[PDB]
Design a protein around this ligand. Sequence first.
Ligand SMILES: C=C(C)[C@H]1CN[C@H](C(=O)O)[C@H]1CC(=O)O
Ligand SMILES: C=C(C)[C@H]1CN[C@H](C(=O)O)[C@H]1CC(=O)O
Ligand SMILES: [Cl-]
Ligand SMILES: [Cl-]
Ligand SMILES: [Cl-]
Ligand SMILES: [Cl-]
Ligand code: NA
Ligand code: NA
Lengths: 254, 254
Amino acid sequence: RTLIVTTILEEPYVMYRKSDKPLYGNDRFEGYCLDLLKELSNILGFLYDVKLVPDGKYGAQNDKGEWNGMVKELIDHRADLAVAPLTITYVREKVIDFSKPFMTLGISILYRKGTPIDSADDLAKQTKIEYGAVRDGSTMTFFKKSKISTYEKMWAFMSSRQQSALVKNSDEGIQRVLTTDYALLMESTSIEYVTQRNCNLTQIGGLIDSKGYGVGTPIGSPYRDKITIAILQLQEEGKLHMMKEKWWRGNGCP
Amino acid sequence: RTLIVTTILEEPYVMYRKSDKPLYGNDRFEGYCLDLLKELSNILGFLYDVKLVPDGKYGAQNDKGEWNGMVKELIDHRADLAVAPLTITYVREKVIDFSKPFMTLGISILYRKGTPIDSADDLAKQTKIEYGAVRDGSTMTFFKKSKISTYEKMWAFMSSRQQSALVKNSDEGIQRVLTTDYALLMESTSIEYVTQRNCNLTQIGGLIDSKGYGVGTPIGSPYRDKITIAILQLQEEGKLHMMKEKWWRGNGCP
Ligand SMILES: C=C(C)[C@H]1CN[C@H](C(=O)O)[C@H]1CC(=O)O
Ligand SMILES: C=C(C)[C@H]1CN[C@H](C(=O)O)[C@H]1CC(=O)O
Ligand SMILES: [Cl-]
Ligand SMILES: [Cl-]
Ligand SMILES: [Cl-]
Ligand SMILES: [Cl-]
Ligand code: NA
Ligand code: NA
């Protein structure tokens, strides 16, 4: 009866709450995605247990084409929903069922302020500034699969030297941008959150693609359509907008 | 199989081609949506027969909850697909199925350049400049249903005086903006198209909301998921972006 919700720590979507005593169960967590789940639970009338994905991955395929991460949890019916910044992509939609998007976004560039760099092609025609993405995430996959010239050049650079330009996670990418001469290809909603908090960083250029985050369900799940309708309701009522402004607003940067 | 596709004339989605002799069948039409249908038909391997919706409407409910337009064609299984700038909304998703969005947009304001107006709250707080939307479209319905104070205010104004501030169609709205002191609340992708072609008009403010256009199918159709997967493929390949640029780009503005 109670639904199992797979998710992953990622600021400001899902974070451990701060407290002076050990926390248990759903009380461990806060964030945009917990607020979304509370609003979805309200509308649809389910109870839920939040479970962190045991392997700490979003969802990609190994050499055998077996999935991992939140995507695999859904496939195997070890979770009923995945509520996280899980990008809606062609390869994932073949294997699980996403709701319609609760957030739309695109890949863009995180870099330091004050420089002459203005676009992905400024990066691509040069080698002094290093640049990369989180290994095996949807942004990397976009560069890997692209047949657009500029993105191909960029993939050749990223993948070169046993992928030394890639990072394991966004926090590693951020620190590399802050310390060295490095630009991170990152989803725009995460760039917005980061630039609101570190005033030496900025987004470079616009969005190079367009995509959404959606709630994952196993293929065939009856919850996919109920959740899509509830998301559309929350969007039209201004509630998704309110939730984004609650979690993104920073107060310290020009 | 040959699919039956319901659609509606709307620039630059679906337009009559120019020819010195009469045109027949699918050859009557061109535009972004025809290009999309060709790409979907190449991926999924169907033939198709394009039919203009007989009542010339997108789809809205009357007081008795009865539907019209392309939505009613799908509900009644008179068409297999609706391919048009058909906004994905809560009320429509309850009665038909949409693919994931092939375009993502929001309501914004079309107005003349060179004025002090910068946002919907600027319009809401006054009564001198008239403003409205296409009657019974998804933009009107957004305002009708909103409980956000600004938008309630705007709906009270739009709906006053026997809805004299509303218009029957987008071209009527565009002419009214060009001639009189009037602002049109319009989906942002159409404002883009218009302002590329009318250098005296501009978008005012940003997007008020976030929504998409999707291919519509009857509820339960097996094509909906196939078309979603095909749209995601076309997005990731950059084809949807190239299709938008092809149909939107104008001759330039001074
Ligand atoms: C935080 C990361 C690893 C996730 C979030 N959305 C993408 C995904 O769902 O693959 C990944 C980011 C990226 O690839 O830029
Ligand atoms: C062109 C119009 C009448 C359509 C297009 N999408 C909206 C729909 O699908 O309702 C309507 C526009 C709007 O309401 O601003
Ligand atoms: Cl857990
Ligand atoms: Cl698997
Ligand atoms: Cl026809
Ligand atoms: Cl969907
Ligand atoms: Na799917
Ligand atoms: Na539906």
